[PDB]
Amino acid sequence: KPIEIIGAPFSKGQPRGGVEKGPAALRKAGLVEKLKETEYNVRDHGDLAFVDVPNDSPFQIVKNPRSVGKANEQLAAVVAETQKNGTISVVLGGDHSMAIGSISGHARVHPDLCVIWVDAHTDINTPLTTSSGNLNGQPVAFLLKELKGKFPDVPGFSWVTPCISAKDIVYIGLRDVDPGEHYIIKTLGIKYFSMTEVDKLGIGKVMEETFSYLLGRKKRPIHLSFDVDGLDPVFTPATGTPVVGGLSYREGLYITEEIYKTGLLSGLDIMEVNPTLGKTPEEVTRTVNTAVALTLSCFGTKREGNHKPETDYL
Amino acid sequence: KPIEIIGAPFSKGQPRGGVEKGPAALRKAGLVEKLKETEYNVRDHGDLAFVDVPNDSPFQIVKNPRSVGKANEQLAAVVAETQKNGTISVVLGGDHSMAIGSISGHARVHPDLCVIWVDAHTDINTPLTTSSGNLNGQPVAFLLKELKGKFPDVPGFSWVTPCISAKDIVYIGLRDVDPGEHYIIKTLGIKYFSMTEVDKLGIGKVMEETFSYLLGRKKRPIHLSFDVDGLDPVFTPATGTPVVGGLSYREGLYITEEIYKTGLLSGLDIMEVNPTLGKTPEEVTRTVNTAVALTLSCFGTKREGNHKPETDYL
Amino acid sequence: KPIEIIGAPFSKGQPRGGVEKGPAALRKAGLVEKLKETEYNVRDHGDLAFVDVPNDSPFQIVKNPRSVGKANEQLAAVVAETQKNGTISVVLGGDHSMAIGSISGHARVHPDLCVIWVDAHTDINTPLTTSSGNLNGQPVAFLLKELKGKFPDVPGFSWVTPCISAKDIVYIGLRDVDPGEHYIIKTLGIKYFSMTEVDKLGIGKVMEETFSYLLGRKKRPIHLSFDVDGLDPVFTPATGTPVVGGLSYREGLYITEEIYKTGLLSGLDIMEVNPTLGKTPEEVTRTVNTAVALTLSCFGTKREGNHKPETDYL
Ligand SMILES: [Mn+2]
Ligand SMILES: [Mn+2]
Ligand SMILES: [Mn+2]
Ligand SMILES: [Mn+2]
Ligand SMILES: [Mn+2]
Ligand SMILES: [Mn+2]
């Protein structure tokens, strides 16, 4: 199968300068070369160039609406295109906000896709619920059909079309949920596994459920939109919103491994890596290194080891 | 329901100066204000003032017997009083030694209470078994009916009355148990879950058992007497007796969460926080911060998030 | 039962100077004295003195073949001898390479022994498969009957005799497996539990399987050859090959505990501790301390606590 790395150097989704530098940091780390060594064909589509909308006045609270709307629009166009060509897309972020268009394009080619959202936050705040204008906790709100019209249309997102509903998504590792955001997910009965559920059940049982829940009936394309703020800071320290008591480098690798083993991996988002927020070159190397680790995992690097077929090492 | 924060600036229970400063540190951290924001009414009864008994000569080995006996006596009086008024008590420690009177008063109003003891040590050394005169590993011995007369009466505790028996308590996170102390618990068949049991079972299954075991038949009031030396030092580093390989900030939060969900939370002890034993302002902030975290958990702060009822955030 | 501590100050098995100093560091830490306090008799046989073969030219790739071969030869002689005297051997390493002769001697007295290999690496690279000439990933290849003649004989190991086969060994904590090494283990159907299996199953279930698998039918002597690179660096940081996402100080202690509880503990290897690779005296103290911790565990120190029999602490 083919792999399409797509650059997403964006940051307007939030107030902390840095996330744009993400893809550059991941690539430098040897992301593209390492992948090749896998059983997949890899093509690096490069980084998209986002046109900065001048005088992007705030829509009430929401910040840089037009900038974000446009950037995403462009992305959904590219994702949609490669998905069309039947290649598995891999979106290197900026900030999560770009999850909007990375799923949009995908649903376009695969309308019956399910979504496994790895984050510590729901990011389902609507333009009426955000405490900050950061589109960085609103991605899911623009994607849900259930939340359609449940808030004013925003400058620049006129193009988005709620592609998935609450019966297709599954959060994993929630540990910082705002009131409004807890309300919504309880209201729309959205399937999740906050850190407590993980604790209780175990990464293993949790992955077993998310799977029978999102695939029990129909086997469909899976979209893994991973927030690096998903794991604990001790592994992914260079992020905008580090929340203590998160997913272990193991638990998380487990995840990307099982999902590899489903063979249904279609789209993948590596978001919120921020090479500048590193308190020491070490925390930035650490952060990056595991990010690359998850990715290679999603594409078959097993911890039990790997060997090329048909080769007699004896 | 009402909440009564009760100050317990005591330290004679052990040889390391510092634990008295605990409550001041926790409050500074915003313990009382944060609680209010919960669905409970909160009243800060302040810190008790412990009268120092002059010439408190050692009872054989046991140190500062009178000082401790008196301090506890006073506490059991206050706890007993608020419990009477039907409010859920929350004892901010010093050292664990004050667990004696914090449960005493409680049993007085609720004679059929069960106890979930979170610590890394049993603290069930009797005046004949302690290697050190520290009443800080003897709290349970003064509370157990089974251990009645199994040791000489001590100067100042004449007042205590073994309120609970071995069939009502459950340890969680034992990792440093002295010979005498392992003997006793094996002798009186005391239900526990040392780190190994947690490992084997899982925080989840463990909380499921402790619950069917202590509540299967009769639903009763629960007294959560939490030692901060319960979790691993990497989370609660500022303590008198740090033992490696302990309860994760998650596992522990899981606990305080399930117990919240039983609705049977009556008395709560936050003991052995010691702001002075911090190797760096960081370890003291860390220690404190989680202590406050457990507490707010016990009172409903879920990791899956929270929202006030009847409010349409839409 | 008797315990024989055997010194193995060796390092030629790899390119990083330091592992020889291991035993000195462990002993300094109070390894021998602490053991005595256990229910076993302890004798410290001292450290062996390894004769340095001059002009030990490389066998193709393999480095210092003769040096390693000879050192091991000597060890297998001593191990074989004490095992004969029916005492449980405990080999303090250098590098793992010495696992070769520490098992050799053992099989000599106990030909039907099983092996639980705790490491993060398989160390089953054959002289044809190693990327480096480091006999430090080849121990298992010289021990397996299945790999007999599957590579050229090496200068100095003429003496070794494949004592165990693939149906007697069980790896635990694999997280860095080379191609050739993954091939072999898949080819010879070698039972393992890479970090993922641990994640999935749980230390508990994993120890339950390894046991029904290696002892279900015949109860036999167990040889625990522990690599300190088995646990995560956060606990055992002073090692040649630290791999992220490993065995927790708990999971590992669990292990040495269950194996204690089988009563079948015969030989034990504490390898790759390297006091010099410590970035801070702390990481070296940490590393050592847990190493000693595992060992005392293997010999009965329970986390639930311990008490001498027949003694009334009351
Ligand atoms: Mn996000
Ligand atoms: Mn996030
Ligand atoms: Mn205590
Ligand atoms: Mn304690
Ligand atoms: Mn090894
Ligand atoms: Mn190794």
Rg of chain A? 18 Å
Biggest β-sheet: strands ordered side by side in the sheet of chain A: 2-1-3-7-6-4-5
How many angstroms does the end-to-end distance of chain A come to? 28 Å
The largest inter-chain interface, given as chain pair and residues per side, is: B-C, 30 and 23 residues
CATH topology of chain A: Arginase, Chain A
Oligomeric category: homotrimer
Principal-axes shape call of chain A: globular
**Main sheet summary of chain A:** 7 strands, parallel
The figure for the number of domains of chain A is: 1
Number of strands of chain A: 7
Ligands present: manganese (II) ion
- CATH homology-level superfamily of chain A: Ureohydrolase domain
- Secondary structure class of chain A reads alpha/beta
The portion of residues assigned to helices of chain A is 25-40%
Note the total helix count of chain A.
10
PDB class: hydrolase
Keywords: arginase I, H141N mutant, binuclear manganese cluster, hydrolase
Assembly: trimeric
Entry title: H141N mutant of rat liver arginase I
